[PDB]
RNA sequence: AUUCCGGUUGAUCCUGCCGGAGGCCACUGCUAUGGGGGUCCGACUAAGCCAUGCGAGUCAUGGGGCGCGCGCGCGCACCGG
Protein backbone atom coordinates (compact mmCIF):
# COMPACT_ATOMS: atom_id res chain seq x y z
CA UNK A 561 0.00 0.00 0.00
CA UNK A 562 2.01 2.94 1.32
CA UNK A 563 5.21 1.64 -0.30
CA UNK A 564 3.94 2.28 -3.83
CA UNK A 565 1.92 5.22 -2.47
CA UNK A 566 5.17 7.05 -1.68
CA UNK A 567 7.10 5.61 -4.62
CA UNK A 568 4.60 6.99 -7.13
CA UNK A 569 4.90 10.67 -6.18
CA UNK A 570 8.73 10.72 -5.96
CA UNK A 571 10.75 11.96 -8.92
CA UNK A 572 14.45 11.15 -8.37
CA UNK A 573 17.38 13.50 -8.84
CA UNK A 574 20.32 11.18 -8.07
CA UNK A 575 21.54 7.85 -9.38
CA UNK A 576 20.93 6.14 -6.04
CA UNK A 577 17.39 7.48 -6.05
CA UNK A 578 16.93 6.13 -9.57
CA UNK A 579 18.21 2.67 -8.64
CA UNK A 580 15.99 2.60 -5.56
CA UNK A 581 12.97 3.58 -7.65
CA UNK A 582 13.64 0.97 -10.33
CA UNK A 583 14.55 -1.87 -7.97
CA UNK A 584 18.20 -2.71 -8.55
CA UNK A 585 18.79 -1.86 -4.88
CA UNK A 586 16.15 -3.49 -2.67
CA UNK A 587 17.64 -3.76 0.84
CA UNK A 588 18.90 -1.04 3.16
CA UNK A 589 22.31 -2.66 3.73
CA UNK A 590 23.26 -2.24 0.05
CA UNK A 591 23.80 1.54 0.28
CA UNK A 592 26.17 1.82 3.23
CA UNK A 593 29.74 0.61 3.10
CA UNK A 594 30.27 2.10 -0.32
CA UNK A 595 31.18 5.75 -0.56
CA UNK A 596 27.74 6.77 -1.80
CA UNK A 597 26.33 10.21 -1.13
CA UNK A 598 22.77 10.27 0.17
CA UNK A 599 21.00 13.51 -0.78
CA UNK A 600 17.34 12.46 -0.73
CA UNK A 601 15.30 11.34 2.31
CA UNK A 602 12.95 9.40 0.04
CA UNK A 603 15.59 6.68 -0.35
CA UNK A 604 15.36 6.05 3.38
CA UNK A 605 11.58 6.50 3.54
CA UNK A 606 11.27 3.72 0.94
CA UNK A 607 13.89 1.28 2.22
CA UNK A 608 13.18 1.82 5.96
CA UNK A 609 9.47 2.62 6.30
CA UNK A 610 9.74 2.49 10.11
CA UNK A 611 11.21 6.02 10.18
CA UNK A 612 7.93 7.80 9.43
CA UNK A 613 5.95 6.59 12.44
CA UNK A 614 5.73 9.12 15.25
CA UNK A 615 6.95 6.47 17.69
CA UNK A 616 10.36 6.58 15.94
CA UNK A 617 10.91 10.35 15.57
CA UNK A 618 12.14 11.75 18.89
CA UNK A 619 12.52 15.52 19.06
CA UNK A 620 15.39 16.06 21.48
CA UNK A 621 15.90 19.81 21.83
CA UNK A 622 14.46 23.18 20.89
CA UNK A 623 16.62 26.25 21.47
CA UNK A 624 15.96 29.95 20.92
CA UNK A 625 18.86 31.83 19.32
CA UNK A 626 19.34 35.57 18.82
CA UNK A 627 21.03 37.87 16.31
CA UNK A 628 21.58 41.65 16.74
CA UNK A 629 20.62 44.12 13.95
CA UNK A 630 20.00 47.29 15.96
CA UNK A 631 18.53 47.66 14.69
CA UNK A 632 16.29 45.32 16.69
CA UNK A 633 17.23 41.72 17.56
CA UNK A 634 16.08 38.74 15.41
CA UNK A 635 14.84 35.43 16.94
CA UNK A 636 15.51 31.99 15.39
CA UNK A 637 14.87 28.37 16.35
CA UNK A 638 17.42 25.56 16.47
CA UNK A 639 16.04 22.02 16.64
CA UNK A 640 17.85 18.74 17.31
CA UNK A 641 16.03 15.56 16.30
CA UNK A 642 16.70 11.84 16.10
CA UNK A 643 15.08 9.13 14.01
CA UNK A 644 15.48 5.40 13.72
CA UNK A 645 14.24 1.86 13.50
CA UNK A 646 14.66 -0.12 16.69
CA UNK A 647 16.75 -2.82 14.99
CA UNK A 648 20.11 -1.31 14.08
CA UNK A 649 19.59 2.01 12.24
CA UNK A 650 19.65 5.52 13.82
CA UNK A 651 20.30 9.09 12.57
CA UNK A 652 20.60 12.58 14.10
CA UNK A 653 20.06 16.06 12.68
CA UNK A 654 19.96 19.77 13.43
CA UNK A 655 17.70 22.36 11.83
CA UNK A 656 17.67 26.15 11.51
CA UNK A 657 14.30 27.81 11.27
CA UNK A 658 12.23 30.94 11.52
CA UNK A 659 9.32 28.84 12.78
CA UNK A 660 9.37 25.66 14.83
CA UNK A 661 7.60 23.63 12.15
CA UNK A 662 10.24 24.54 9.57
CA UNK A 663 13.03 23.77 12.02
CA UNK A 664 11.56 20.38 12.96
CA UNK A 665 10.99 19.22 9.38
CA UNK A 666 14.47 20.26 8.26
CA UNK A 667 16.00 18.51 11.27
CA UNK A 668 14.16 15.26 10.61
CA UNK A 669 15.17 15.25 6.95
CA UNK A 670 18.82 15.83 7.85
CA UNK A 671 18.49 13.00 10.39
CA UNK A 672 17.20 10.63 7.72
CA UNK A 673 20.10 11.57 5.47
CA UNK A 674 22.61 11.10 8.32
CA UNK A 675 21.74 7.44 8.83
CA UNK A 676 24.23 4.86 10.14
CA UNK A 677 24.33 1.12 10.82
CA UNK A 678 25.50 -0.35 14.13
CA UNK A 679 26.51 -3.67 15.69
CA UNK A 680 24.97 -5.40 18.70
CA UNK A 681 25.68 -8.37 20.94
CA UNK A 682 26.58 -9.44 24.46
CA UNK A 683 30.04 -8.97 25.94
CA UNK A 684 29.43 -8.65 29.67
CA UNK A 685 31.11 -10.79 32.31
CA UNK A 686 27.70 -11.26 33.94
CA UNK A 687 25.38 -12.53 31.17
CA UNK A 688 27.47 -14.31 28.49
CA UNK A 689 24.33 -15.02 26.51
CA UNK A 690 24.71 -14.99 22.74
CA UNK A 691 21.78 -12.65 22.08
CA UNK A 692 21.93 -9.05 20.73
CA UNK A 693 20.47 -7.03 23.59
CA UNK A 694 23.46 -4.74 24.22
CA UNK A 695 26.73 -3.78 22.56
CA UNK A 696 29.42 -6.46 22.12
CA UNK A 697 32.34 -4.47 23.56
CA UNK A 698 33.17 -1.11 25.12
CA UNK A 699 33.42 2.03 23.00
CA UNK A 700 34.32 5.71 23.32
CA UNK A 701 32.95 8.85 21.69
CA UNK A 702 33.58 12.57 21.92
CA UNK A 703 32.29 15.93 20.73
CA UNK A 704 33.20 19.30 22.16
CA UNK A 705 34.07 18.83 25.82
CA UNK A 706 31.91 15.70 26.24
CA UNK A 707 33.48 12.25 26.53
CA UNK A 708 31.28 9.13 26.60
CA UNK A 709 32.28 5.55 27.38
CA UNK A 710 29.70 2.83 26.76
CA UNK A 711 30.09 -0.59 28.41
CA UNK A 712 28.15 -3.85 27.91
CA UNK A 713 25.67 -4.89 30.55
CA UNK A 714 23.39 -7.80 31.41
CA UNK A 715 19.77 -8.44 30.52
CA UNK A 716 17.23 -6.63 32.66
CA UNK A 717 19.61 -3.74 33.37
CA UNK A 718 18.02 -0.91 31.48
CA UNK A 719 20.10 1.90 30.04
CA UNK A 720 22.06 3.43 32.89
CA UNK A 721 22.71 6.72 31.10
CA UNK A 722 21.28 10.20 30.75
CA UNK A 723 17.98 10.70 28.96
CA UNK A 724 19.32 11.91 25.61
CA UNK A 725 21.36 8.73 25.34
CA UNK A 726 18.36 6.74 26.53
CA UNK A 727 16.33 7.95 23.57
CA UNK A 728 19.12 7.50 21.03
CA UNK A 729 19.88 3.96 22.20
CA UNK A 730 16.19 3.02 22.30
CA UNK A 731 15.90 4.09 18.67
CA UNK A 732 19.06 2.17 17.78
CA UNK A 733 17.68 -0.97 19.41
CA UNK A 734 19.83 -1.29 22.55
CA UNK A 735 18.26 -2.46 25.79
CA UNK A 736 21.08 -2.67 28.36
CA UNK A 737 24.22 -0.58 28.86
CA UNK A 738 26.47 1.02 31.48
CA UNK A 739 27.97 4.49 30.99
CA UNK A 740 30.77 6.80 32.07
CA UNK A 741 30.86 10.46 31.00
CA UNK A 742 33.17 13.45 31.24
CA UNK A 743 32.62 17.11 30.40
CA UNK A 744 29.52 19.26 30.10
CA UNK A 745 26.46 17.07 29.56
CA UNK A 746 24.11 20.05 29.75
CA UNK A 747 25.07 20.86 26.16
CA UNK A 748 22.49 18.50 24.70
CA UNK A 749 23.83 18.82 21.15
CA UNK A 750 27.32 17.67 22.07
CA UNK A 751 26.15 14.97 24.47
CA UNK A 752 23.96 13.54 21.71
CA UNK A 753 26.69 13.69 19.07
CA UNK A 754 29.10 11.96 21.46
CA UNK A 755 26.69 9.07 22.04
CA UNK A 756 26.06 8.84 18.29
CA UNK A 757 29.79 8.68 17.55
CA UNK A 758 30.30 6.02 20.21
CA UNK A 759 27.66 3.89 18.50
CA UNK A 760 29.34 4.51 15.14
CA UNK A 761 32.75 3.44 16.47
CA UNK A 762 31.41 -0.08 17.07
CA UNK A 763 32.46 -0.63 13.45
CA UNK A 764 36.09 0.44 13.97
CA UNK A 765 37.14 -2.40 16.31
CA UNK A 766 38.92 -5.32 14.66
CA UNK A 767 37.67 -8.81 15.44
CA UNK A 768 38.05 -12.43 14.37
CA UNK A 769 35.69 -15.18 13.18
CA UNK A 770 35.35 -16.65 16.70
CA UNK A 771 34.30 -13.37 18.33
CA UNK A 772 31.15 -13.37 16.20
CA UNK A 773 29.97 -16.67 17.66
CA UNK A 774 31.20 -15.82 21.15
CA UNK A 775 29.36 -12.49 21.39
CA UNK A 776 26.43 -13.08 19.02
CA UNK A 777 27.44 -10.15 16.84
CA UNK A 778 24.85 -8.75 14.44
CA UNK A 779 25.38 -6.07 11.78
CA UNK A 780 22.11 -4.24 11.22
CA UNK A 781 18.80 -6.08 11.37
CA UNK A 782 18.56 -9.21 13.48
CA UNK A 783 17.27 -12.61 12.39
C1' A B 784 20.39 2.84 37.59
C1' U B 785 28.66 2.41 37.22
C1' U B 786 22.63 8.64 35.83
C1' C B 787 22.08 13.82 35.73
C1' C B 788 19.13 18.56 36.02
C1' G B 789 18.99 24.78 37.32
C1' G B 790 22.17 29.14 37.62
C1' U B 791 27.58 34.11 34.67
C1' U B 792 25.80 36.14 27.91
C1' G B 793 22.05 40.35 23.49
C1' A B 794 23.14 35.01 21.79
C1' U B 795 27.65 30.66 22.09
C1' C B 796 31.21 27.06 23.68
C1' C B 797 34.36 26.32 28.31
C1' U B 798 36.48 26.49 33.37
C1' G B 799 34.62 26.52 38.06
C1' C B 800 31.72 26.95 42.54
C1' C B 801 26.59 27.27 44.74
C1' G B 802 21.98 24.68 44.72
C1' G B 803 18.37 20.31 43.61
C1' A B 804 17.32 15.12 43.62
C1' G B 805 18.93 9.56 47.61
C1' G B 806 20.36 7.14 52.44
C1' C B 807 21.36 6.85 57.97
C1' C B 808 21.59 9.31 63.01
C1' A B 809 19.62 13.31 66.78
C1' C B 810 16.09 17.40 68.10
C1' U B 811 11.24 19.35 66.70
C1' G B 812 5.68 21.12 64.13
C1' C B 813 1.03 18.87 62.78
C1' U B 814 -1.48 14.14 63.12
C1' A B 815 -2.21 8.88 64.90
C1' U B 816 -6.46 2.07 64.87
C1' G B 817 -4.12 -3.39 66.27
C1' G B 818 -0.85 -7.16 66.97
C1' G B 819 4.22 -9.47 67.03
C1' G B 820 9.93 -9.42 67.44
C1' G B 821 14.57 -6.81 69.16
C1' U B 822 21.25 -6.24 71.67
C1' C B 823 16.44 1.20 72.13
C1' C B 824 15.35 5.32 76.10
C1' G B 825 20.49 11.71 80.80
C1' A B 826 26.58 9.17 76.13
C1' C B 827 26.57 15.03 73.31
C1' U B 828 25.33 19.73 78.47
C1' A B 829 27.13 18.85 84.97
C1' A B 830 32.66 11.90 86.37
C1' G B 831 26.74 18.00 88.79
C1' C B 832 23.34 17.81 93.90
C1' C B 833 19.88 15.50 97.17
C1' A B 834 15.51 12.36 100.62
C1' U B 835 13.36 7.75 101.58
C1' G B 836 14.00 2.41 101.06
C1' C B 837 16.39 -1.64 98.90
C1' G B 838 20.74 -3.96 96.20
C1' A B 839 25.37 -10.14 100.22
C1' G B 840 24.44 -14.00 102.50
C1' U B 841 24.57 -18.91 104.33
C1' C B 842 25.60 -23.37 107.68
C1' A B 843 22.08 -27.59 114.19
C1' U B 844 26.18 -32.96 109.80
C1' G B 845 31.47 -26.83 113.87
C1' G B 846 30.14 -24.92 119.68
C1' G B 847 27.77 -23.10 124.09
C1' G B 848 23.40 -20.58 125.90
C1' C B 849 17.91 -19.03 126.16
C1' G B 850 13.19 -19.36 125.09
C1' C B 851 8.55 -21.96 122.91
C1' G B 852 6.65 -26.70 122.71
C1' C B 853 6.47 -32.37 122.91
C1' G B 854 15.01 -37.52 126.61
C1' C B 855 12.38 -35.11 119.97
C1' G B 856 11.47 -30.76 117.46
C1' C B 857 10.65 -24.87 116.47
C1' G B 858 12.80 -20.22 117.09
C1' C B 859 16.46 -15.81 119.20
C1' A B 860 21.04 -13.30 119.33
C1' C B 861 26.35 -15.01 120.13
C1' C B 862 31.35 -17.52 119.14
C1' G B 863 33.29 -20.02 114.53
C1' G B 864 33.75 -21.46 109.04
Ligand SMILES: [Zn+2]
Pocket residue numbers: 682684687688689690691693713714715
Ligand atom coordinates in the same frame (compact mmCIF):
# COMPACT_ATOMS: atom_id res chain seq x y z
ZN1 LIG C 1 23.58 -11.11 27.89
